[PDB]
């Protein structure tokens, strides 16, 4: 039901055609229906289950870990190759890509790496224990809601937006000023 939760809550299922990669979209079902589908699937072979809370609901707040530094350096080694430094997009082989992590709630982040949706690998509970996963999700959630220091973020990719901003703002302003001061012909 972890796979079902991830695929239906994020809207990937049901899929609509066969291409390089199925995109995410608005969900088709709600929480009750999601749980029903998950339980129906779980009764036909077993497998992973979504973590719950003390009230029987999906755990969101309890999945946030304490240590953000250990989560950060686990993310940088295991997850920053496909995703970005802070969780932006990344291109894959042919028509495929790793999405942005700035929209997923803790349960979604937890269940993404528990099952393995697509060309993303799966991290079992023995490879990454369900304590390191909490730190990873904490890092992912924090690096998405922290404001930029020193001005506008410019997307968070680095040299390319910086270069384009330079060319389209600084040089344009400089040339305009030069044309104002100087003369023609």
């Amino acid at each position: 039901e972890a796979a079902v939760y991830f695929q239906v809550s994020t809207g990937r299922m049901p899929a609509m055609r066969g291409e390089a990669q199925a995109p995410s979209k608005p969900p088709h079902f709600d929480e009750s229906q999601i749980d029903a589908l998950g339980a129906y699937v779980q009764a036909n072979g077993g497998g992973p289950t979504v973590p719950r809370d003390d009230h029987g609901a999906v755990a969101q707040e309890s999945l946030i870990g304490g240590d953000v530094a250990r989560g950060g350096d686990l993310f940088r080694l295991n997850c920053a190759s496909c995703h970005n430094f802070t969780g932006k997009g990344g291109a894959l082989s042919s028509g495929k890509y790793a999405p942005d992590l700035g929209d997923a709630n803790p349960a979604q982040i937890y269940t993404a790496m528990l099952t393995g949706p697509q060309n993303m690998p799966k991290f079992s509970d023995r490879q990454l224990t369900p304590d390191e996963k909490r730190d990873i999700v904490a890092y992912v959630r924090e690096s998405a809601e922290t404001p930029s220091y020193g001005g506008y973020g410019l997307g968070g990719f680095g040299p390319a937006p910086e270069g384009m901003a330079m060319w389209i703002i600084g040089m344009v302003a400089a040339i305009g000023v030069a044309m104002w001061i100087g003369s023609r012909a």
Binding site: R70, S81, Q127
Partner: protein
Amino acid sequence: GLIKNPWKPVVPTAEGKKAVLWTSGWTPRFKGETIYLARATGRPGESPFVKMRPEDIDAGGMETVFPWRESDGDGTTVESEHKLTEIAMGVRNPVMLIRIKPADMHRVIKRKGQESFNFGELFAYTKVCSHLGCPSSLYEQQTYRILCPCHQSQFDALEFAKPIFGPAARALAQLPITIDEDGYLVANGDFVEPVGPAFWERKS
């Protein structure tokens, strides 16, 4: 004063002193030495490298492993604090260990001398790109492709990590693996070729 001979024997191995470029962290230091495949788990003050079992990684997973000997360990003291740092900063140290689905085991091609370098459905390859040395570690587990995010060369896992796209011309190196009497993963020796980028006096 800044002219140095690169082909000078400085590294002690199980066969005498050897040049730097011929060796790595996986080279045996004496005959019958046990090198464990360790993983980076915790903080520097909390035993950063620990042992691993074949049961930990499942089908369609990948892990990064490092060479760890019993002679280092914990890093609590100052003697093992500089020994655990050399392992993590080694140029040719990291290895990617992948587990292949049993359904896809009939389409594996070996490399004429590396026919016994795998333990069932576990394979281990160098994590260093053979083009310019970037960590080629973008592993697509359905298409079974290893992608380098530096110059966009991808390698085929089902074959002997031979390039299929990009500016790479050589295949990734394989490390032979097996299990220990306790049930931990160990090596059957080092690579049978140099790892990393090429140079003028490479190959026979």
